[PDB]
Each structure stands twice: as structure tokens, then as C-alpha cells.
Amino acid sequence: REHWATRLGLILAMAGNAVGLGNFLRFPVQAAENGGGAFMIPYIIAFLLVGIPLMWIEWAMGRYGGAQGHGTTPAIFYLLWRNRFAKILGVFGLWIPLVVAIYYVYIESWTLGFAIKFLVGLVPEPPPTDPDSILRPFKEFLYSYIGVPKGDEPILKPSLFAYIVFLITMFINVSILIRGISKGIERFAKIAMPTLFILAVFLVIRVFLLETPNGTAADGLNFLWTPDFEKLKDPGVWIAAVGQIFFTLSLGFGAIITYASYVRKDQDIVLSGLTAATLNEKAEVILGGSISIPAAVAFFGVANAVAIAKAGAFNLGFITLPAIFSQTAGGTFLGFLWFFLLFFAGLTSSIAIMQPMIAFLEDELKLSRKHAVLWTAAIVFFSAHLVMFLNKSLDEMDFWAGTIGVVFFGLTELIIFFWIFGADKAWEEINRGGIIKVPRIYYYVMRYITPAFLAVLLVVWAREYIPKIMEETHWTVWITRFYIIGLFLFLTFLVFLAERRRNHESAGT
Amino acid sequence: REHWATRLGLILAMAGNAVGLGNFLRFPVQAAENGGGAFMIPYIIAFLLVGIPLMWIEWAMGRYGGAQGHGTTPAIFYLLWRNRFAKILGVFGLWIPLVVAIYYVYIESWTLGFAIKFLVGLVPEPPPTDPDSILRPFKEFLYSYIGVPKGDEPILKPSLFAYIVFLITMFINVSILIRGISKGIERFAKIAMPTLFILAVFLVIRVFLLETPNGTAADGLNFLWTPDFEKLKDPGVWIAAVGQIFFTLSLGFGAIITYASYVRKDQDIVLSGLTAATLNEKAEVILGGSISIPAAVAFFGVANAVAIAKAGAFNLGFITLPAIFSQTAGGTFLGFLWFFLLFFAGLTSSIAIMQPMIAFLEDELKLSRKHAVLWTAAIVFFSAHLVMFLNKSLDEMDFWAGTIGVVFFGLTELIIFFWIFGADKAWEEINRGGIIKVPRIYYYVMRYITPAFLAVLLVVWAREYIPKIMEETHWTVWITRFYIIGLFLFLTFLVFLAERRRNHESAGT
Numbered sequence A, B: 001r002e003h004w005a006t007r008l009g010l011i012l013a014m015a016g017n018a019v020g021l022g023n024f025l026r027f028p029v030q031a032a033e034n035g036g037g038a039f040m041i042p043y044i045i046a047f048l049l050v051g052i053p054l055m056w057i058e059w060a061m062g063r064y065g066g067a068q069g070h071g072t073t074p075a076i077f078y079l080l081w082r083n084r085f086a087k088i089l090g091v092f093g094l095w096i097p098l099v100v101a102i103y104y105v106y107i108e109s110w111t112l113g114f115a116i117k118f119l120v121g122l123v124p125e126p127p128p129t130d131p132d133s134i135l136r137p138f139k140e141f142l143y144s145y146i147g148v149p150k151g152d153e154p155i156l157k158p159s160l161f162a163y164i165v166f167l168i169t170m171f172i173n174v175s176i177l178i179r180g181i182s183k184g185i186e187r188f189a190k191i192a193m194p195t196l197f198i199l200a201v202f203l204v205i206r207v208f209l210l211e212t213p214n215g216t217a218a219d220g221l222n223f224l225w226t227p228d229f230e231k232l233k234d235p236g237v238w239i240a241a242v243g244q245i246f247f248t249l250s251l252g253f254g255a256i257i258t259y260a261s262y263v264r265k266d267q268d269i270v271l272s273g274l275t276a277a278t279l280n281e282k283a284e285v286i287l288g289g290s291i292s293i294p295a296a297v298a299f300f301g302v303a304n305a306v307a308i309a310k311a312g313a314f315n316l317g318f319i320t321l322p323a324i325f326s327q328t329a330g331g332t333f334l335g336f337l338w339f340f341l342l343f344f345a346g347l348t349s350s351i352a353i354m355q356p357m358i359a360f361l362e363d364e365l366k367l368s369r370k371h372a373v374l375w376t377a378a379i380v381f382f383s384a385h386l387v388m389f390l391n392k393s394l395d396e397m398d399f400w401a402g403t404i405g406v407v408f409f410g411l412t413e414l415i416i417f418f419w420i421f422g423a424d425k426a427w428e429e430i431n432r433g434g435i436i437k438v439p440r441i442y443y444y445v446m447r448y449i450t451p452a453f454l455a456v457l458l459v460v461w462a463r464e465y466i467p468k469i470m471e472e473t474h475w476t477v478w479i480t481r482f483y484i485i486g487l488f489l490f491l492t493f494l495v496f497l498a499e500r501r502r503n504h505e506s507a508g509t
């Protein structure tokens, strides 16, 4: 089985798995919509009671499965719980990352497309003070790129450039993945992460120099880091914070588990896991939190900045920030650096979310790495046409897989590993070979607190937030639901084939 | 490998494969729309130059593949032409029947649902002379059953009864298929075909007694059997006739090939194939042609009857005929007998079109018959939800698979078998073990005439009839196109897995 070559490589690859679009695009919007400072308390708590513990648990499950030649959940869940239902629940560990990849790689391709256009200077020209006269050109720019509906039909018409850039993006993902864990992903991470860090720091510095009649970047930081305890009673803020924690750390995606399946049996995961997690949090709150929000607040003030964040999920990063940059000397190039940053952040994450399917095809169906990578790319490429052309399909997939799915799967993996497999056996497995030991208190957090925390969250979620959304949607949401349910059925069939191949092979030996 | 137990069983199963909804629903509409008698000349010619020859060719290919343990085209095409492209082209032999099954079984379920409701008397009550006051209740009846759109959204809302009946229908198909070729399909055919014949004859007799101020059943027969040579120059009529010939004989579906793969290596296929084909033609022109059209003409006259046929594909069989029957004593029960006839005709055909996928899973992926049948039913059941809920999805699938697909595949199988594999080797393979020999003239028809006939047809088709339809359709057609293209990709992936299992198994022996 492949293995990470170096400790540093392992840490940077895991860091790249986590540090992505979630840090620079998702976090700012989530924090801004939920009162900035009021979002941070629940966020910090969620990191300590959910983020950290689940991270160790996934690293442990992955290393454990890898030692037996298995890197994905259908097999690993079965090793931890010899029950047919374990294999079925394990399918979510392939389904969630596949579905997220289907829309994540497309958004990633937009950042490459924008980077290219900003680099060559093929960008809108704002009319040298009206805020709408400056923002409109950038909104039209994004709308023409992805092809937002002008009529009443829920259809998108992406530009030819956008389509070709998606193809190029898939090619780049394949060019890294096809070389494997050590020579592909690990080698790339050592180049991408340092670049990402430098670009991010530079951008924060440039943003910190912004000052207008409406405010300064400093005002943005105070809005984000000023606590509002009167919001700690709001369930919505807790749901938002926990959701962000899962997404940003790649938890419940089956991705951390698959990467960890390449860690040697004796190798530490306690310190390595904690380091990867801490690196992501720094990139998120210090870098991601210091670019978009402060820039928006400085130019528009808090009230307007928050309104912009609520406007959409892409408004801030694809329309507002470049518009703001366009008002400064060298602003077009700064826009290029922003999109290039987003691209590398996205790329290091998309290779991580597609590796689970690759690992399954290699480990369970015995496909060569080449064939496994190519078929995975084909399924993602084909499936992405739904997100490219059907308005709101992206939103639907992000909801079921990227929001509900990850939380549900996180609770599922915890219950299989810490309750069914055995709390003490699990604790023993996590600490084995550790450079440091997990604080004793976390044994009780993992066994009682984390699972109770998530169970409640999911309950309040399903009875006070979904009944409304799961009934007021346009009929076209069923097209996406139908298709992703089919993807689940397809993956279940592959797991069935994998078990039949195992039986036949065994009976032959 | 399984084999048909008796010669009679083989003939009745093949006859059941062919005699279906195409005979009683499709033929009447096709003939009526294309000038009745004017349709029959091209139809007869198509049967002689296309129907008969391709039938022998498919039986030959199937028996040939079966002798080597292969019943589906991905493998058989490869045996006839050792080229990777042969395996890919062969995928259509699994894709076409799967797609047709996805809508065919649903229409079949409607006949069971209607049979049930007509039997118990839960049918509309026409107001005891206005033609619309009598037809409207039956139109509303069908519309409420399948859930035709009342607004502008292209969405269907089938009744709960219709949905449950579809489930029951799938169960019945599974209950026959799971028992296999001899104890399942063959045993059922010996019971279904005789029943079908008796019900059909009885219905023809009852229809022949109809006489109204507008005409008699006799007028219907003269409309159908009176030649109109001024239409022999119309390409559209030729396309219609050839299309019906393929559909009614199950040619280009990969279904005749799979059934023939269970015929013993030495067993005759010349006489058996010809008999199955002739039986279908009798059931089609004599039985199918003598029920719907004569009844409609007798009550409405020719002009109105033709208009009704053009109105829709289901108008005549699900609305008009029962409406006509309702005006006669015992008419509700006659309606029950009609739908029961359609159900048995459909059932004997749906088991035939689902067997190719079952044979592939058993032959190439080594699944047990139980597992192969259940997974096939699951894929069809799941996929059918698209046809159940998206208006016109059924039409789109029928077009690509049931109309264009079968013709294209028929030309493909002929060129692989008679040109690539070898005209003389093919001719030798067809006649081997024959109780009778194929007339010498057919050697030249198969090698030069049939392929030229179809090639021209397809060309005129693609440059004078599709450019118009492939551009004026509602955007929702892309949902169905997207999904069935995905089905093709899925099946291609399974063929890829089958070849890898073969390689690994071989290297182990």
C-alpha cells in the first residue's frame, strides 16, 4: 500500500485537504450572516467539542483500516462492526465526497477562469462613486460566466470559456491524482501550501491598508472579534457554527479517513492530526477572516457588508472583493492574486475529496491507479453537467451532502468507532504510537459529549429548519435529488460487487 | 448454461417476446396515421427485406454466443470482432432494452391498473349521443390515473393507485424472471400465449358485430387493407413502417439475441425463427389490426378515426376503445378483457427486454440469478420514476432507444456479423442445424440489400426529420437525455469491470 513519504508532507497534504474554499469563501459569509463576533463563540466551542475529537477519530479509523489494506468507510465500518448494515452506512463515505466534488470542482474552475481573465486584464471597467455603478459590472461579469437565468426557466448557460476552464481544471486534478499519494498529492502539497500561505498573508496586508469615508479594515476585525452573548441562545447560530466546523475541517467527508489510511501503522496521528486541524483554523480565522470582511466593511461599513454577505454565497468573493480591488492601483492584479489563492486552496481540497472514490476502486475492486483515477474523473465530469446547467442544483447538492450529510456521517462514525467497536479499544487505537497522548478529558467528550451535542443539533435541525425548506422549493430540486439518490444506489451496487469479488477470490485461495 | 426445455416452449417464449403492446397499441396508430392501406405495402416489404433476415441473424448470433457462455452483445460482438470498439458498440445491446424497459413496464402497469378498475366496475359513467360527453369521462379517467399536467409545469402526478400497481407489476415480472428460462419464462409463455390468442380472437369477434349510423367494422378493415400507391413515394411512410417492424419483432433490442443464447448449439433456428416472426405478424395484422381501428371507424367513421389516432399514442387504446365499449351491453367487462389482453401481451414482452441485463450480470459479472434479477429490477424501478413524474420523458426514451436506437443497432449487428465476421461464415452459422435452409436469395439480401436499405433510411431520417425535432423541444428533454446518457456510461463501466474480472480470473488459471 502507498504511504506518505515524510511527516511534513503528510501534514501539508492533510492541511491542504482542510484549507480550501471553505476558509476563504464559506467562513466569511457564515460569520458575517451570524453577527460576526456572535458566531465566533459557538465556533470556538464547536472546534473544541467536535472538530478536534472527530479529527482524531477519523485519523485513527483511517490508519486502522489502511493497515489492513482498506481506506474507505464501506470496508472500514465493516472491520469495526461486522454487520451488513455497516457496509451500507459506509456508502455515505463515498457518496458524500463524490457529491461534494461534483459541485466543488466546478466552483474551483471558476476561480481558475477568473484568475486567467484578471491576469490578462479581460475584466469589467467600472465608471470612475455610485456603489451600484461599480458593483454592477462585476455582477454582470460573474453572471455571464456561469450563465445566470435571464428569463423564468431555471436553466443556466455557462460561457464557452467557463466550460473549457472546467475541463482544464479536471485535467489538472487528474494530473496530480494519477501520480498517487507520495509523488502526486504529497509533492504538490509541499509546493501549494507555502504558496497559499504567502499569497494569503500578502492579501491580508493589502486589505489592512484600506481606508474610506465609510471605515477601515480595523472596523472589520472588531466586528468579527467582538462577542455578542445575547446570540448564544439562538440555535441557528450553533447550527451554522457546527456546520462550518465540519465543512472546513473536511470532517464527515470520508476524506480525512482515506488520507490517514496511507499513514504507517505505527506512525503518530495525535500530534499530526492536531497540527493539521490547528493549521486550518489559523488559515480560516486569521487569513480567511481578515480578507473579505475587513475589505467589505472598510468600503461599505458593517451594515452594508452584512447585507452583501446575506445576498448570496458567492457575492462577496466573486463580485464584491474584486469590485473593491478595482478601486485601487494595481487592483486588477490583486484580483488575480485573490483568485489564484482560491484556486490553489480549492485544488488541494478537490484532490482530497476525490481520493476516497479512487481508493475504493483500487482497494475493493482492484483497479489500477490509472483506471481508478480516470473513471472517478469521468463520473465527476459527467455529473457536473447537472450543476453547470440546472439553476440551484449546486445548492441542493451542497445541502444534502455538504451540510446535512457530513453532520449525520460524523455522528455515525463516532457511534461505530466509540460505541460499537468499543470506547476503550478506540481510545487505545487513537493513542497508539502517539508522540503525545490525547488529554484524558477528551475520552469523556468523545464518548458522551460529542455524540449528544450532534444528536441534539440534528434533532433541532430536522424539526425547526428543514420542514420549511423541504416543502417550499421549486419542483426542479427533485431532478437533483433523483440523480444523487441514483448515485447512492450506484455506489451501493459497487460495494455489492466488491463483496462478491472478495468471496470468489477467497474461495479460490 | 440454461436451455429451453421444449421446442414449443422456445417458440412460444420467442413469440411472447415479440407479441406485445407494439401489436395492439403501436401498430393501429402507426397504420392509421399513415393512410392505413398506404402503410401496409411498405410494411410488408420491410418485413421481407428487414424483419425476416435480421430475425435469423439475431437468432444465429445468440445461439453462437450461448455456446460459449455469452448471451449479450458486449461479449458476442467481441467474439465476432476482436476489437475494443466491438465491446463498446455492444453496450447498446444492454442500454436499448434497459431504456425501453424503463417506460415499457410502466405502460404495462397501466393496463393492469385499468384491468383491475374495469373488472370491479370503478369506471366513468358516460351520459346516456354527444361524442365528447362520452369520450371526456374516459379521457379524464386516464389523465387522473397518470396525472397529466393541469398547469404549465411539465410535471406528472400519478395517482396512488397507479404507483402501487407499478410496484405490483414489477413484482410480477420479478416472480417470473427469478425462476429462470425454463421454469420461469418458458413455463409462463405456455400459459400466456394461448390465453392471449383466445382473448384477442374473442375481441375481434365482438368488434366485428359493431354497426352504427357512421359505419361498420367492415369499413375499418377496408381502410386498412386498401392500397394507396401514391404514398409509396413518401419517405415518412417508409420510416414509419420500418420503425414498426423493428419494434414489433423486438429487433435491435438485444432481446432476441439473449433468448436465442439459450438455444442448444445444434438446435434449429431457421424454422423456429421464421415461425416466431410469422406468429407475431399474424397477431399484429390480423388481431391487432382488427380490434382498435375497426371499432373506431365503425363508431366515428374513417376521417374521425384517423384524427383520433393522430391525437396521441394512447388515445385509441386507453380512451377511445373503452369509451366505445361502454356503449354496449357488457361493455365494462369487454374493457376488462381488452386491458387484461394488453397486460399479458406486455408482460411476456417486458420479461424478454429485462433478460439481457440479467444475462449480462450472470454471464459476465457472475452474479447468481437471484441477485441479477433483483438488481435489474431495482435499476428499472428507480429509473422509472423519471417516466412517472416528468412529462414527455417517456416520449424521449421511446425516441432514442425505441425508435432510432433499434434501427441503428440493427444495422450495426448486421455489419459486424455479415461483413466483419464474414458473410460466408455467418451464412454457414445461420443454416447450421436448420430443419430447413434459408432461401439462397436471402444471402444477397442480408449482405447487400438490408444494410443498404437501412443506411439510406437512417440518412434520410437524420437530415430531414430530426433536425426539426432536435431543436424545437422543451428544455426538460435534456433531463432525460442526461439520465440515459448516464445509464450508457454506467453500463460501459460494468463492461470494463467484466473484462478486468476475466483477466484476473484467467491469470489465476
Ligand SMILES: CCCCCCCCO[C@@H]1O[C@H](CO)[C@@H](O)[C@H](O)[C@H]1O
Pocket: A157, A158, A159, A160, A161, A163, A382, A385
Ligand atoms: C461527454 C458528456 C457531454 C454532455 C453534453 C455537454 C454539452 C455541452 O455543450 C456545450 O456547452 C457549453 C457551455 O454552455 C457551450 O459554450 C458549447 O457551445 C456547447 O457545445
Ligand SMILES: CCCCCCCCO[C@@H]1O[C@H](CO)[C@@H](O)[C@H](O)[C@H]1O
Pocket: A116, A159, A160, A161, A164
Ligand atoms: C486557458 C484556456 C483558454 C481558452 C479560451 C477559450 C476562448 C473561447 O473562445 C471564444 O468564445 C466566445 C464565446 O463563444 C466567442 O465569442 C469568441 O469569439 C471565441 O474566441
Ligand SMILES: CCCCCCCCO[C@@H]1O[C@H](CO)[C@@H](O)[C@H](O)[C@H]1O
Pocket: A021, A022, A025, A026, A107, A310, A311, A312, A313, A314, A394, A395, A398, A399
Ligand atoms: C466551498 C464552496 C462553498 C459554496 C457554498 C454553496 C452554498 C449553497 O449555495 C448557496 O446557498 C445560499 C442559501 O441557500 C444562497 O443564498 C446562495 O445564493 C447560494 O449560492
Ligand SMILES: CCCCCCCCO[C@@H]1O[C@H](CO)[C@@H](O)[C@H](O)[C@H]1O
Pocket: A156, A157, A158, A385, A386, A389, A390, B478, B479, B482
Ligand atoms: C444536465 C446536463 C444538461 C446538458 C445539456 C447541454 C445542452 C447543450 O448546451 C446548449 O446547446 C443549445 C444549442 O446549441 C444552446 O442554444 C444553449 O444555449 C446551450 O446551453
Ligand SMILES: CCCCCCCCO[C@@H]1O[C@H](CO)[C@@H](O)[C@H](O)[C@H]1O
Pocket: A048, A049, A438, A439, A440, A441, A445
Ligand atoms: C472541553 C475540552 C477541553 C480540552 C482542553 C484540555 C486541556 C488539557 O488539560 C490537561 O490534560 C492533561 C492530560 O490529561 C492533564 O494531566 C492536565 O492536568 C490537564 O490540565
Ligand SMILES: CCCCCCCCO[C@@H]1O[C@H](CO)[C@@H](O)[C@H](O)[C@H]1O
Pocket: A471, A472, A473, A474, A475, A476, A478, A479, A482, B153, B155, B386, B389, B390, B479
Ligand atoms: C424529473 C422531474 C421530477 C419532478 C417531480 C416533481 C414532484 C412534485 O413536486 C412538487 O411540485 C409542486 C409544484 O411545482 C411544488 O410546489 C412542491 O414544492 C414540489 O415538492
Ligand SMILES: CCCCCCCCO[C@@H]1O[C@H](CO)[C@@H](O)[C@H](O)[C@H]1O
Pocket: B157, B158, B159, B160, B161, B163, B382, B385
Ligand atoms: C425507492 C425510490 C423512492 C423514490 C421516491 C418516490 C416518491 C414517490 O412518492 C409517492 O408518489 C405517489 C404517486 O404520485 C403518491 O401517490 C404517494 O403519496 C407518494 O408518497
Ligand SMILES: CCCCCCCCO[C@@H]1O[C@H](CO)[C@@H](O)[C@H](O)[C@H]1O
Pocket: B116, B159, B160, B161, B164
Ligand atoms: C390490487 C392492489 C390495489 C391497491 C389499491 C390501492 C388504493 C389506494 O388507496 C386509496 O387512494 C386514494 C388516493 O390517494 C384515496 O383517496 C383513497 O381513500 C384510498 O383508499
Ligand SMILES: CCCCCCCCO[C@@H]1O[C@H](CO)[C@@H](O)[C@H](O)[C@H]1O
Pocket: B021, B022, B025, B026, B107, B310, B311, B312, B313, B314, B394, B395, B398, B399
Ligand atoms: C409499446 C408502447 C408504445 C408506446 C408508444 C410511445 C410513443 C412515444 O410517446 C408518444 O409520442 C407521440 C409523438 O411524439 C405523441 O403524439 C404521443 O402523445 C406520445 O404518447
Ligand SMILES: CCCCCCCCO[C@@H]1O[C@H](CO)[C@@H](O)[C@H](O)[C@H]1O
Pocket: A478, A479, A482, B156, B157, B158, B385, B386, B389, B390
Ligand atoms: C424523477 C423522480 C422524481 C420523484 C419525485 C417524487 C416526489 C414525491 O411526490 C410528490 O410529493 C409531494 C408532497 O407530498 C406532493 O405534493 C406531490 O403531488 C407528489 O407528486
Ligand SMILES: CCCCCCCCO[C@@H]1O[C@H](CO)[C@@H](O)[C@H](O)[C@H]1O
Pocket: B048, B049, B438, B439, B440, B441, B445
Ligand atoms: C426479397 C425476398 C424474397 C424472399 C422469397 C423467397 C422465396 C424462396 O424462393 C425459392 O427458394 C429456393 C431455395 O433457394 C429455390 O430453390 C426456389 O427455386 C425459389 O423459388
Ligand SMILES: CCCCCCCCO[C@@H]1O[C@H](CO)[C@@H](O)[C@H](O)[C@H]1O
Pocket: A153, A155, A386, A389, A390, A479, B471, B472, B473, B474, B475, B476, B478, B479, B482
Ligand atoms: C437538468 C436540466 C438541464 C437543462 C439544460 C438546458 C440547456 C438549454 O436547452 C435549450 O433551452 C432553450 C430554452 O428553453 C430551448 O428553446 C432549446 O430548444 C433547448 O435545447
Ligand code: NA
Pocket: A018, A019, A020, A022, A023, A247, A248, A249, A250, A280, A284
Ligand atoms: Na477548511
Ligand code: NA
Pocket: A015, A016, A017, A018, A019, A020, A021, A344, A345, A346, A347, A348, A349, A350
Ligand atoms: Na485545499
Ligand code: NA
Pocket: B018, B019, B020, B022, B023, B247, B248, B249, B250, B280, B284
Ligand atoms: Na410485436
Ligand code: NA
Pocket: B015, B016, B017, B018, B019, B020, B021, B344, B345, B346, B347, B348, B349, B350
Ligand atoms: Na409479449
